[PDB]
Amino acid sequence: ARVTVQDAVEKIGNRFDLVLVAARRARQMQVGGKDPLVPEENDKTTVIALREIEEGLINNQILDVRERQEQQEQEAAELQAVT
């Protein structure tokens, strides 16, 4: 359900970091076991990542901010567990 990504590159810019962020998001869905926020109407990871880019929910900034938050919360949970 995606044939033109012009509205996606206009959202991200430079047409290059969009590929990297979409690849990271698709890897998060596929091997990372993440939950696709947008509805999944029988599609695989890459187009869910592209549509999430389109809707503006995910970009580079939100992605690494969420990654840092997950890292710090899991570190806190681990240190609580060992203590």
Among the residue ranges 36-44, 58-66, 75-83, the one whose residues contact another protein (CB under 8 A): 36-44
Judge residue 12's burial from the number of C-beta atoms within 10 Å of its C-beta, 0-12 exposed, 13-18 middle, 19 or more buried. buried
Site for another protein in 47-66 (CB under 8 A): 47, 49-50
Give Cβ neighbours of residue 66 (< 8 Å, ≥ 6 apart): none
Q: Note whether 22 binds another protein by CB under 8 A.
A: yes
Q: Among 48, 60, 45, 44, which Cα is nearest to 11's?
A: 60
The residue within the footprint of another protein, chosen from 11, 43, 54, 63 (CB under 8 A), is 43
Among the residue ranges 18-26, 33-41, 64-72, 73-81, the one whose residues contact another protein (CB under 8 A): 18-26
DSSP type of residue 16? S
Binding site for another protein (CB under 8 A): 2-6, 9, 15, 18-19, 22-23, 26-27, 30, 42-47, 49-50
